Write a protein that binds this DNA or RNA. Structure first.
Lengths: 305, 49, 49, 143
RNA sequence: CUAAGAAAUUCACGGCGGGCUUGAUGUCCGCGUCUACCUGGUUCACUGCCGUGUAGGCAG
DNA sequence: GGTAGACGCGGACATCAAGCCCGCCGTGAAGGTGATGACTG
DNA sequence: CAGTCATCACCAA
């Protein structure tokens, strides 16, 4: 909601062994729920000793590879597993399947606090990076440096105090540091828009998302067409099955302080657009916003349109 | 490369069977070495099989 | 890789025609392998902790 | 050891870079890690062994390197003169096919942790090193 | 406070044998490059000249 | 240590016949749940 | 005489 003044680039985050299932109906790149949980986990450890805030994340995703294998006679995939230790009788344990992938990621944060005028912003950049290099980005660890120990420091720059001409040179200087990536935004208006193509059939909604991430072909009145983006099904929050429980009610909870619901996933849509296609970089940022009483929990990116 | 340790398995399920196998191989080794095997491998190196 | 049938064959379905001739017949497999080059003798392994 | 201990306390910074050289021989076969692929290739034109590669390089999994680093346990009560094994609850070893440190011989992690937290029955110092090593290792426990 | 928090895939291997690519051919044809001039670079900032020591007649 | 000012056209590009057989494709481990059954302190 | 620990059949395209 609150537009930040300065954006914080976390330039290279080579992370290993992230989760790659992310919902019961998708696989591949992890959910942006992991990224906004990561930035509020930065908020509870750094942002109070700097008296700043950090709300939104610019998910860029330079590289991607998944620990998958192509079997014989199939065009599908399976996942490469770990070998778990034995049971107490010496026999072998069962198999729970955890997909796994390596990533390389850039990040764009948003500051809102009095520490930006109480400090140099280099203090904010150094402290946020040196603490975030001891955390887990999606489900896996954040790696230290290598041959790539030259892009290690950050950058940070405001947008309100300054001229209004060479800020194009400034944000396209920023774009020189995230140039091979594909940003990930929320494009859920097209899920509305592809019901009118099915309005001749029914006003149903659950099979509309399963129409866009594939190759639909009819014959000549072969029918291939340019898909209008890199449009992919992402998960987009939780919807309540069960009423809110008082913090001593549910057996085997993580906490004895917070209240608990039983929820399940809701599915949206995204696109892997290059950052050139959007003018202002503050459009990309992902935010948590969810109303508590009726149980709809959701994350999206505002300011995209 | 000639490695050695040629009776100890690298993966097993039993421990009694592993000890029985290792003492069987030690029974083989401590009355005759690998010499009858080693000179036959040395024959197949010495000619150009 | 070309190979031989060298496993404990199953006499559960004891066939005097198939499991004795399949001992004679070969076994074709596809594996992975990693070698050093012919002009390298030292392996380097690097990680961080 | 003082540096790794001052990192395990939470006090100072620690980040190691480990490089190992191993003279083997010209053109010999090195052994990177093999990943478990359960039920691949129902066609018989299949691939039996599949090795693990990071980008254009042979590689070893991280959990195997960690398993190598936590071979600490010498104190297990079955037969201690056979070498250190990896730190485990119900302290076991998959190549051996056998679980040392069995709860009938009350020295596994659950028994000692409950006696040393809930009942204040302190075990010996050598079992306490095991109980703390399971906290450096980490785990997931329940009811 | 992140479908959070945890994990060893291990081991073995013979692809193998055989073989005629043949034959043919026109790259032809043409052309104005045109005018102009001062190294004693210092072919070593000095060769070789009565005392190897800081004053001198020489091929100047 | 001198500018000076230009680089061609047309036309054409081969036909024929043929493409192998045989055998074979590894094994081990990857189940939770009550319900007595044996133990029982 | 009552909790608890290893085993035991129960299913199953």
């Amino acid at each position: 909601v609150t537009d930040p003044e300065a954006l914080l680039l976390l330039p290279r985050l080579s992370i290993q062994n992230a989760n790659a299932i992310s919902s019961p109906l998708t696989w591949g790149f992890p959910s942006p729920g992991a990224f906004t949980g990561f930035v509020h986990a930065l908020q509870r450890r750094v942002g109070i000793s700097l008296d700043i805030e950090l709300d939104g994340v610019g998910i860029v995703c330079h590289r991607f590879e998944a620990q998958i294998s192509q079997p014989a006679g199939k065009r599908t995939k399976v996942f490469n597993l770990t070998r778990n230790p034995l049971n107490r009788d010496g026999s072998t344990a069962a198999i729970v399947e955890e997909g796994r992938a390596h990533l390389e990621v850039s990040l764009l944060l948003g500051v809102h606090g009095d520490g930006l005028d109480d400090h140099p912003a280099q203090e904010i950049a150094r402290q946020v990076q040196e603490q975030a290099g001891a955390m887990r980005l999606a489900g896996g660890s954040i790696l230290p440096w290598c041959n790539e120990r030259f892009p290690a420091p950050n950058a940070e720059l405001l947008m309100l105090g300054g001229s209004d001409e060479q800020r194009r040179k400034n944000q396209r200087r920023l774009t020189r540091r995230l140039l091979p990536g594909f940003a990930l935004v929320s494009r859920e208006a097209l899920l509305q828009q592809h019901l009118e193509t099915l309005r001749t059939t029914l006003p149903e909604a659950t099979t509309l998302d399963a129409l866009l991430d594939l190759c639909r072909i009819n014959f000549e009145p072969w029918q291939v067409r340019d898909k209008p983006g890199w449009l992919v099904p992402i998960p987009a929050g939780y919807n309540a099955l069960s009423p809110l429980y008082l913090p001593g009610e549910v057996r085997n909870a993580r906490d004895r302080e917070t209240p608990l619901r039983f929820v399940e996933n809701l599915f949206g849509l995204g696109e892997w657009l290059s950052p050139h296609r959007v003018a202002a970089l503050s459009d990309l940022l992902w935010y948590h916003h969810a109303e508590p009483d009726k149980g709809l929990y959701r994350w999206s990116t505002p300011r995209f349109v | 490369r000639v490695l050695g340790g040629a009776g100890t398995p690298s993966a097993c399920n039993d421990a009694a069977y592993r000890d029985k196998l290792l003492q069987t191989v030690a029974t083989y080794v401590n009355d005759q070495g690998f010499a009858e095997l080693a000179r036959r491998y040395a024959h197949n190196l010495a000619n150009a099989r | 890789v070309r190979g031989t049938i060298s496993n404990r064959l199953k006499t559960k379905d004891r066939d005097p025609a198939k499991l004795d001739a399949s001992i004679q017949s070969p076994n074709l497999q596809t594996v992975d392998v990693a070698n050093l080059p012919s002009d390298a003798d030292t392996l380097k392994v690097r990680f961080t902790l | 050891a003082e540096l790794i201990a001052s990192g395990l306390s939470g006090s100072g910074h620690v980040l190691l870079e480990v490089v190992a050289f191993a003279r083997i021989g010209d053109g010999q076969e090195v052994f990177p890690s093999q990943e478990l692929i359960l039920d691949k290739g129902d066609k018989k034109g299949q691939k039996s062994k599949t090795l693990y590669s990071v980008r254009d390089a042979a590689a070893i999994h991280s959990q195997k390197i960690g398993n190598a680093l936590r071979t600490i346990d010498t104190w297990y009560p079955d037969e201690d003169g056979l070498g250190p094994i990896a730190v485990e609850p119900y302290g076991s070893v998959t190549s051996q096919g056998k679980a040392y440190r069995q709860p009938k011989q009350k020295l596994d992690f659950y028994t000692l942790l409950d006696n040393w937290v809930l009942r204040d029955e302190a075990p010996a110092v050598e079992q306490q090193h095991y109980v703390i090593a399971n906290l450096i290792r980490g785990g997931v426990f329940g009811e």
